[PDB]
Amino acid sequence: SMADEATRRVVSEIPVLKTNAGPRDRELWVQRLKEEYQSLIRYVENNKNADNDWFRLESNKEGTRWFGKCWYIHDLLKYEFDIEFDIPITYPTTAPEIAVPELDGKCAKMYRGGKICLTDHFKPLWARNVPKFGLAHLMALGLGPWLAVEIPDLIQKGVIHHKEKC
C-alpha cells in the first residue's frame, strides 16, 4: 500500500494516542488530553529539529476549543494564518474541522466560515486509525498538506499578499 507507507512516513515519530474519550468524558477526557499534549509537544520538537516549526496551538481550560497560528513558507517568504477548531462531542472517532477564518470566501477548497475542505482520502484514513490519531496527526496529515496546495495557489492568483514588515 502506497497510502499506508505515505501515512507511516509522515506520522511514525508522533506519539500514538490510546483513549476513546471526548469532551463530555470526565477523567477519561483528562487522560485523552494528556495524550494529546504529549503527542503535540513531541511533534513540535520534531518539527523544530526538521527546520519546519510550522504551528503553535493552545486550548481553553477544558481542552474543547483550540486556536493558534500556522506558518507557510513560499519563495522564502513566511505567511502566518490564524487557525481554530472545536473538539466534536464524538471525538476522537470524528475528526475536528480546522478553520482558517481569514481565508473564508477566498479559497474553493474551503467551506463557508473558513473550515478547510480536505480530500476524500483524509476521512477514511482518520477512521481506519481511530483512536490512535489525535490533533498532532490532524495537523500533519490534514492541514499540512492542505496548505502545501492551497497557499501556493492563492499566492499565484494574487488572493494572498505578503505584508512588508520589519
From Swiss-Prot:
Query: Could you say what the effect of mutating I41R is?
Result: Abolished interaction with UFL1
- Annotated Gene3D superfamilies: Ubiquitin Conjugating Enzyme
- What keywords appear on the UniProt entry? Disease variant, Isopeptide bond, Ubl conjugation, Ubl conjugation pathway
**Which residues constitute the signal peptide according to the record?**
none
Q: Which GO terms describe its molecular function?
A: UFM1 conjugating enzyme activity; UFM1 transferase activity
Q: Write out the PTM section of this UniProt entry.
A: Ufmylated at Lys-123. Deufmylated by UFSP1.
Phenotype when changing K109A: Abolished ufmylation
Cross-link Glycyl lysine isopeptide (Lys-Gly) (interchain with G-Cter in UFM1): where in chain: K123
Q: What is known of its domains?
A: In absence of UBA5, the active site is solvated by water molecules thereby reducing its nucleophilic activity. A linker region of UBA5 is required to reduce the amount of water molecules in the vicinity of the active site and elevate its nucleophilic activity.
Which family is annotated? Belongs to the ubiquitin-conjugating enzyme family. UFC1 subfamily.
**Any idea what this protein is called?**
Ubiquitin-fold modifier-conjugating enzyme 1
Species this chain originates from? Homo sapiens (Human)
Gene name as annotated: UFC1
